[PDB]
Paper text:
MRGPRX4 is a Gq-coupled GPCR expressed specifically in small-diameter peripheral itch-sensing neurons of the dorsal root ganglia (DRG) and trigeminal ganglia (TG). Previously, our group and others have identified MRGPRX4 as being a bile acid and bilirubin receptor which potentially mediates a component of cholestatic itch as well as a receptor for nateglinide, an anti-diabetic drug that causes itch. Using unbiased high-throughput drug screens, we identified the Mas-related G protein-coupled receptor X4 (MRGPRX4), a primate-specific, sensory neuron receptor previously implicated in itch, as a potential target for phosphate-modified compounds. Using both Gq-mediated calcium mobilization and G protein-independent GPCR assays, we found that phosphate-modified compounds potently activate MRGPRX4.
Author numbering:
A (entry chain E): 2 to 120, 124 to 235
B (entry chain D): 11 to 61
C (entry chain C): 3 to 340
D (entry chain B): 4 to 51, 68 to 87, 93 to 246
E (entry chain R): 26 to 160, 175 to 276
């Protein structure tokens, strides 16, 4: 599977551009496709969402009336349209696929990025903004929420992500307890409503980076500032 | 050359059976010991009914 | 010679009949006469899962007791979210004539088969967002009646070849072939421990098989016509056998004998499916008179009717936790009862 | 309420529902036919696991399955019609053919399924009847009394003995069909030669009759 | 002079309302949807509305109420009658199509065509119905209703002709029964109401006896029509 994004460059303020997300290797029409931007200094912020069949469309409050999202099912391409660009839209734009059903693992694959430069919600914050680590040890990350993430149907819609240095982020834990495919079993997740922990066992190399907790209760999807794991 | 049937009958007849009363009591015991943990025999509570 | 072998077989059959009659001291009715009756089991419809446009032939329940697979004669398997009626997948079959379903206990695979002589295993939890065929299992010369999953990489298949087989999905070979029947085997029911399984045939007979060794251990003959349905007691020490002569019998293994006889005067349609309950007290039997009768397993008395169908019930399953029971009919509607 | 993931699951279910509906609206317009006939009968040359032959005449499609009939016959309960092929040329197999037909006619699950009946190899029948080497009356006791009726619709280019034997063979199946059926399904007999190209028109016309019957039996006309 | 006819109409209407309600329940829950069941459900619903209005008609007649109120009731009552007759014609025409062209009717027919035709008929009802008992263009309802009568006549005749020239028609005893009963009832028990409605003020012969005789007879016959329709269309199978 490969999501490759083209477009985005050096643009004057107030201009317009077009972002592309070429897909190769899956049933594109059966996938809901998000757009997530990371500011050059900040963390992850949700932008738009287009469903399977171009049915439901959601935008963030900060890009409503300025962005347009549309997909080309025949040619397998996702488009994001820029209107009235401002200096707060400089970021690296990520294209994410998500499927929704019983047993699904939304936010499995994230694409690369297109560096663009322009020349209430459930706000949840990871208190540990910077944590050290030593190889062979166990580290716990914590994420506290605003409103409870335990729904009436017994599901806690909280997700854990991981961005290695200079790479697109990767899913670790979906629904507070379930490990994703390709993730070593040493990652474990626990937590109640408005209190969550991500326990690593035997924190080895290639597991350092920034860990993000997002909520999938209600739109807009909200992330946290992350948690560096240095040496 | 149909010795398979007689061979199977010889291998099946020479087995150790039990009495019908013992096995019937086994069925009674298994049924009765779980009548407190079956959702259809007794009316299911509204708390544990997902339907 | 032929006469000598015939005489030996007749003598052995008479000896086995005498042995069974020697152990016939007390029947299940004689003892269970002194048990409090259940009463009247009244359970009503709670979900009507619609979307199939043709007769529903098989359904199965996942081990999680929330998902159920269904195959219909129009060429589509559907995986259902029972609590919500939602559909999870819709596998388009290559052949539209399917008579069997099989949901893996792990939940990663489903199986189908029918008149095309082939068992097709479908991979569900994969990337690329599409359910695709894992492996096609050729090797029978007749319609595949039933397919059950022993484990993630084993499957037991029955055919109208008078033959049952065991496969390795990873390799594709027949590890063993279960010969011995004389008619088209139509049903097989795995034992709870997944080391034994019984299979019923149109010759009015059921044989208990040993999966590993590969030999028939016991041969039960009390019916007068075909055996459409068969199911183990939850203990793993008894099994009920549905037949076209409207009679259900509760056979027993350690005694090699019939215990109870669930037959009524005003019933003539043959059975279509038989299942038990978690506690092993109720016996749900699906008939051709368009409704399901709920017997008391230990006392052979009816307890209620699930009369909500306007065609025959072709399939009937009970969840592994006992919460619900699902009847599928030729009217193309599933129904969940609790 | 319902979470965001529940709503997306609902929309996926609706997309699946839609696709199922178009598949149904596609498959509804194909007539569906079951072909039987034991052997030495000529199943291959009727219309120029399960083998499925598809042909289209007058803009309607047909699927004509033949399984290479005890317990799987309940699967074909919703078919439009069953094509039955009997070889009239051979006379020692005709009784087996009649018994097979009588089994399929009086089957519990086929009590509302009509049967087109094809009697193949009429040229060989003419040859073995004109030649006179064998006699149908030898195998069949009851051919002496029978005489050709006053409505011998068969063309004049056939000798009286040929027509008489042909109509006797037709009668031996029609009396099976028209004995105990209660009018729920009927049998349309036809004669063929295995070298006739206009052989799907007959299936098409009989099918028009079958569909008309079920339409006026569904809309209370009866 | 009038109370007797009023009571007879009321009782027959009560029975017919009961039957139509039974048909409504059956076609709503017990049975599935055919290509003819939707039309029959609509005809039964129209009969329910017509006979409910007749039920509320029954008591108010003896009671001295405002005659403007009576005319308002008459108009809002002749609204569902036109749905009823239009559907009694649509059923026969669709059945004629189903016997003329069977492969079409069972293979290549839009599924929502029944809904389209029925809602279009429901809408056309009031548009050509507001022209009512003076509620001088009263000549167009006559054309509409006579056209519908000819529609039922030709549909009946064609469905009769096609099976006349058939072969071994076993139900030939019952085909004549069903079709002749339908056409005769719709002609001699369902037209008089709509015919009086147009001749009510076109013909000023003798308003004194007109009211009593013709309106009593026509109301009773329309009630009988509406009471018997679901019985003959559904209870026979
Ligand atoms: C033709 C109808 C509309 C009519 C004409 C003239 C006079 C009256 C009443 C007001 C005395 C009429 O209404 C009958 O109402 P009914 O007696 O059936 O309730």
């Amino acid at each position: 599977v490969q999501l490759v994004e083209s477009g985005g460059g050096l643009v004057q303020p107030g201009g317009s551009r077009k972002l592309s997300c070429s897909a190769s290797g899956f049933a594109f029409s059966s996938f809901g496709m998000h757009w997530v931007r990371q500011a050059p200094e900040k963390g992850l912020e949700w932008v738009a969402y287009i469903s399977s069949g171009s049915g439901t469309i959601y935008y963030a409050d900060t890009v409503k009336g300025r962005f347009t999202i549309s997909r080309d099912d025949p040619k397998n391409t996702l488009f994001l349209q820029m209107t009235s660009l401002r200096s707060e839209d400089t970021a690296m734009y990520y294209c994410v696929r998500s499927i929704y059903y019983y047993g699904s693992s939304p936010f499995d694959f994230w694409g690369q990025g297109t560096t663009l430069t322009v020349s209430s919600d459930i706000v949840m914050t990871q208190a540990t903004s910077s944590v050290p680590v030593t190889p062979g040890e166990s580290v716990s990350i914590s994420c506290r929420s605003s409103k409870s993430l335990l729904h009436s149907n017994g599901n806690t819609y909280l997700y854990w992500f991981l961005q290695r240095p200079g790479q697109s982020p990767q899913l670790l834990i979906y629904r507070m307890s379930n490990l994703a495919s390709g993730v070593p079993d040493r990652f474990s997740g626990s937590g109640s409503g408005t209190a969550f922990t991500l326990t690593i066992s035997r924190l080895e190399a290639e597991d350092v980076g920034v860990y993000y907790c997002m909520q999938h209760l209600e739109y807009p999807l909200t992330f946290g500032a992350g948690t560096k794991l240095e040496l | 050359q149909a010795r398979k049937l007689v061979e199977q009958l010889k291998m099946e007849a020479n087995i150790d059976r039990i009495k019908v009363s013992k096995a019937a009591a086994d069925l009674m015991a298994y049924c009765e010991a779980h009548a407190k943990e079956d959702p259809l025999l007794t009316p299911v509570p509204a708390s544990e009914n997902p339907f | 010679e032929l006469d000598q072998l015939r005489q030996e077989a007749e003598q052995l059959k008479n000896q086995i009949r005498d042995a069974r009659k020697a152990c016939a001291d007390a029947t299940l009715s004689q003892i269970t006469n002194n048990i409090d009756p259940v009463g009247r089991i009244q359970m009503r419809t709670r979900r009507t899962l619609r979307g199939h446009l043709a007769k529903i032939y098989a359904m199965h329940w996942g081990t999680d007791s929330r998902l159920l697979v269904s195959a219909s004669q129009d060429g589509k398997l559907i995986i259902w979210d029972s609590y919500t009626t939602n559909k999870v997948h819709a596998i388009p079959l290559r052949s539209s004539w399917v008579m069997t379903c099989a949901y893996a206990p792990s939940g990663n695979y489903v199986a189908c088969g029918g008149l095309d002589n082939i068992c097709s295993i479908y991979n569900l939890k994969t990337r690329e967002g599409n359910v695709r065929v894992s492996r096609e299992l050729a090797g029978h010369t007749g319609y595949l009646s039933c397919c059950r999953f022993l484990d993630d990489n084993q499957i037991v298949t029955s055919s109208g070849d008078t033959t049952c087989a065991l496969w390795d999905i990873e390799t594709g070979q027949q590890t063993t072939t279960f010969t011995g029947h004389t008619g088209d085997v139509m049903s097989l029911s795995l034992a709870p421990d997944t080391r034994l399984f019984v299979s019923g045939a149109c010759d009015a007979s059921a044989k208990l098989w040993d999966v590993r060794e590969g030999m028939c251990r016991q041969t039960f003959t009390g019916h007068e016509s075909d055996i459409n349905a068969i199911c183990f007691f939850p203990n793993g020490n008894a099994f009920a056998t549905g037949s076209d002569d409207a009679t259900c019998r509760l056979f027993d293994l350690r005694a090699d004998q019939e215990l109870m006889t669930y037959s009524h005067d005003n019933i003539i349609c043959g059975i279509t499916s038989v299942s038990f309950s978690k506690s092993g007290r109720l016996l749900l039997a699906g008939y051709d008179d368009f409704n399901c009768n709920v017997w008391d397993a230990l006392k052979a008395d009816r307890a209620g009717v699930l009369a909500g169908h306007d065609n025959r019930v072709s399939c009937l399953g009970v969840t592994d936790d006992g919460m619900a029971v699902a009847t599928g009919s030729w009217d193309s509607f599933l129904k969940i009862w609790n | 309420t319902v979470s965001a993931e529940d709503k997306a699951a609902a929309e996926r279910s609706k997309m699946i529902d839609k696709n199922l509906r178009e598949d149904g609206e596609k498959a509804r317009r194909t007539l569906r036919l079951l072909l039987l006939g034991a052997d030495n009968s000529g199943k291959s040359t009727i219309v120029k696991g399960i083998f499925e032959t598809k042909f289209q005449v007058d803009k309607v499609n047909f699927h004509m399955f033949d399984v290479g009939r005890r317990k799987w016959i309940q699967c074909f309960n919703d078919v439009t019609a069953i094509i039955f092929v009997v070889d009239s040329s051979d006379y020692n197999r005709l009784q087996e053919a009649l018994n097979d037909f009588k089994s399929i006619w009086n089957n519990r699950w086929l009590r509302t399924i009509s049967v087109i009946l094809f009697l193949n190899k009429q040229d060989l029948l003419a040859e073995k009847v004109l030649a006179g080497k064998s006699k149908i009356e030898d195998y069949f006791p009851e051919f002496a009394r029978y005489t050709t009726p006053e409505d011998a619709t068969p063309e004049p280019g056939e000798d009286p003995r040929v027509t008489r034997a042909k109509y006797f063979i037709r009668k031996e199946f029609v009396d099976i069909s028209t004995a105990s059926g209660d009018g729920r399904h009927i049998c349309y007999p036809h004669f063929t030669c295995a070298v006739d190209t206009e052989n799907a028109r007959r299936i098409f016309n009989d099918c028009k009759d079958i569909i008309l019957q079920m339409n006026l039996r569904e809309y209370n006309l009866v | 002079q009038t109370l007797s006819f009023t009571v007879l109409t009321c009782i027959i209407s009560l029975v017919g309302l009961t039957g139509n309600a039974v048909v409504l329940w059956l076609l709503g829950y017990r049975m599935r949807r055919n290509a003819v069941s939707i039309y029959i459900l609509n005809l039964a619903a129209a009969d329910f509305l017509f006979l409910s209005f007749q039920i509320i008609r029954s008591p108010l007649r003896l009671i001295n109420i405002s005659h403007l109120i009576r005319k308002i009731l008459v108009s809002v009552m002749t609204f569902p009658y036109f749905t009823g007759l239009s559907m009694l014609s649509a059923i026969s025409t669709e059945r004629c199509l189903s016997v003329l062209w069977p492969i079409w009717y069972r293979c290549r027919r839009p599924t929502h065509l029944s809904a389209v035709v029925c809602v279009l008929l429901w809408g056309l009802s009031l548009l050509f119905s507001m022209l009512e008992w003076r509620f001088t263009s009263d000549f167009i309802p006559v054309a509409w209703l006579i056209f519908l009568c000819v529609v039922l006549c030709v549909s009946s005749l064609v469905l009769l002709v096609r099976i006349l020239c058939g072969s071994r028609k076993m139900p030939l005893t019952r085909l004549y029964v069903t079709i002749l009963l339908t056409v005769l009832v719709f002609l001699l028990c369902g037209l008089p109401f709509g015919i009086l409605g147009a001749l009510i003020y076109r013909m000023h012969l003798n308003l004194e006896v007109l009211y009593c005789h013709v309106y009593l007879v026509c109301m009773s016959l329309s009630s009988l029509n509406s009471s018997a329709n679901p019985i003959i269309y559904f209870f026979v199978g």
